[PDB]
Amino acid sequence: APSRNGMILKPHFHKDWQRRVATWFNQPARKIRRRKARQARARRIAPRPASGPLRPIVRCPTVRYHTKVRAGRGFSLEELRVAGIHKKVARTIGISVDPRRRNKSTESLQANVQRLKEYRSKLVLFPRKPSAPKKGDSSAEELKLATQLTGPVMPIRN
Amino acid sequence: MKFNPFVTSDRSKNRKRHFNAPSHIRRKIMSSPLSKELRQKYNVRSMPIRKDDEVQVVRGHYKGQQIGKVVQVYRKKYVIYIERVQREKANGTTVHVGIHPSKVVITRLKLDKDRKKILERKAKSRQVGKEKGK
C-alpha cells in the first residue's frame, strides 16, 4: 500500500529472477584473460600491427551522430579500384574490405582512397623468401623496423 | 613468501598432504641431519634415515650422547626405533620407543651404492648454488 507521496513505481521482480542473476566476479579474471590472449596474438603476427587491418573512415548515420566520424568495417570496392589495389590482394596486406558498402558522395570516396594511398606509402611489405624479388622493400626498411604498431593503425581523429 | 601459484600454504591441505602421504614420499619427510663431522665431509645437510644407521637422539627424555644403531623405520607412524631407546612395559617386556627422525642426528650412515649416488647428487647441487652465488 502506498503512503503519502512517491513514484508509483513498477519493479520487474515477479518472474523467478534469482534463478537468472548474473554475477560479475569473473570480470578481473576475464579482463586478464583477454589481455593475455591479446598479447599472444600480437606475438603471433610478428611485425604486423597488433590492431588488425586498416579500416576506412566513415560517417555515422542519423541527424544525431551525423557530424562525427568513426572507423568503418572495411574499404569499399570503388575505393580499392581507384587506389589500384586488387581486392583479393588487399586482404593479404592488412586492408579491411567490405563489399556491401555503397558509395554515395565523392567526398567520402576520395578521402578513403587517400587513406589507402597513405597506407601503401608507410607499409613495409616483407618479401616471401629472404631472397628478395619485386614489391618487397629494402633490407634497410626492415632491419630498422620489424616493429609492431601499437594501437589502431593510422587512427581517425574527428 | 611463496609466489608459485600452484603450491598451497593452506593448513588443511598441507596436513592432509602430510598424514595421507605415500611411503616413498614419507621417506623424504622422515629425513634427519648429519653430524657436523659428516656435514663437513660430504657437503650435505641431511639424509633420509634408514634401517641401520648409527644415530644420536638429540631431544626429549632419551636425549643423550650415546650412539645407538637404528632398529626399524615405521613410516606409517612417522617414527624410527633405535637400539637402547626403549622402555619396560608393566610386565617387564622391553618396548622400542619411537623417536621422530628429525630429533635425531646421524653420526654413521649405512652406505650402499644408491646412498652413495644420492650424496653425490646433493653435494653437487649445493656447490652449483655456491658457484651461482659467487
Binding site: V21, T23 | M1, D10, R11
Partner: protein, 259 residues
C-alpha cells in the same frame, strides 16, 4: 551458503490436531530423522534465516578525486613526527622525517644491503619492533590461514625497481611502493593517517610531477591539483593571542557566582 541448504528434505506439516506444533516434519521412515522439524530457521537441520547470497554488494566504489585527496592526506602526515610517532613507529633517532635517500638503493640485490641501510638510517628499531610484535592470532582466523600477525613497518617508496624490491622482501614489516602507483591501503593502514616511509630521491622528486604543486597542474594526472585549504592559520593559539583580536574582546567575566 548453498541454495539447497536446508531444503533437500521433503517435509510436510502434520497439521493441527496431533498435539505437536505445525512445523513441517520429515515425512515417513524408521529413523531418528522422522517427524522432526524441517526448513524452519529454528529447527535442527533447518535453513538459516535469509541465507546469505553471493550477490550481496561486496565491492564499493569511490570517487577518484576523493581517493586522491586521501592519498595526499596520508603523504602530508607522513611528514609530522607526531603523527608518525603516534602511529607507533619508533622514529626517535631518525635524521630527517620526510626521509629521502641516495638512489644506489635501487641497486641492492641482497637483504644484507637493505638491512645495513636501515640500521645506518636508524630505521631498524621499527623492524626490531615488528619482530617483537610477531605473535599468534586470536581465534578462528587461525584455522583459516591468517594464523600469525604482526606490525606494519617502514614504507619504502621507490621510483624504479632496479633490484630493490628483491632486497627489501624478507625484512618483515617493509612494504615497497612505486611512486607512480601509490595506494592508500598501504600509506594509511587501519585508515590511520601517519606511517614512517623512506623515499628515494628519484621518487621524492617525482611526487610534485604526480600531484602538482599549488600553482601548477599535476602534469601526469591529466586534470588535477592539490585540494585547497579551508583555513590557513591552523594554530589558533597564534590567532587568539594576537594583538588584532584580543584588542577586540570584552574582559573575561570569571568570578563563579555559586548558589
Amino acid at each position: 551458503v548453498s541454495e539447497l541448504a536446508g531444503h533437500q528434505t521433503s517435509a510436510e506439516s502434520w497439521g493441527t490436531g496431533r498435539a505437536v506444533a505445525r512445523i513441517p516434519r520429515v515425512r515417513g521412515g524408521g529413523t531418528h530423522r522422522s517427524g522432526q522439524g524441517a526448513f524452519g530457521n529454528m529447527c535442527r537441520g533447518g535453513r538459516m534465516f535469509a541465507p546469505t547470497k553471493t550477490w550481496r554488494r561486496w565491492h564499493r566504489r569511490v570517487n577518484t578525486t576523493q581517493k586522491r585527496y586521501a592519498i595526499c592526506s596520508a603523504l602530508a602526515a607522513s611528514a609530522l613526527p607526531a603523527l608518525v610517532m603516534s602511529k607507533g613507529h619508533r622514529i626517535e633517532e631518525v635524521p630527517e622525517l620526510p626521509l629521502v635517500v641516495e638512489d644506489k638503493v635501487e641497486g641492492y640485490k641482497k637483504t644484507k644491503e637493505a638491512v645495513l641501510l636501515l640500521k645506518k638510517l636508524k630505521a631498524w628499531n621499527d623492524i626490531k619492533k615488528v619482530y617483537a610484535s610477531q605473535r599468534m592470532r586470536a581465534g578462528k582466523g587461525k584455522m583459516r590461514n591468517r594464523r600469525r600477525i604482526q606490525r606494519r613497518g617502514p614504507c619504502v617508496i621507490y621510483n624504479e625497481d632496479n633490484g630493490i624490491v628483491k632486497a627489501f622482501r624478507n625484512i618483515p614489516g617493509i612494504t615497497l611502493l612505486n611512486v607512480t602507483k601509490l595506494n592508500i591501503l598501504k600509506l594509511a593502514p587501519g585508515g590511520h593517517v601517519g606511517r614512517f616511509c623512506i623515499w628515494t630521491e628519484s621518487a621524492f622528486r617525482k611526487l610534485d610531477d604526480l600531484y602538482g604543486t599549488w600553482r601548477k597542474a599535476a602534469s601526469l594526472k591529466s586534470n588535477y591539483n592539490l585540494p585547497m585549504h579551508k583555513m590557513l592559520n591552523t594554530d589558533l593559539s597564534r590567532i587568539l593571542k594576537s594583538p588584532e583580536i584580543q584588542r577586540a574582546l570584552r574582559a573575561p567575566r570569571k568570578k563563579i557566582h555559586r548558589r
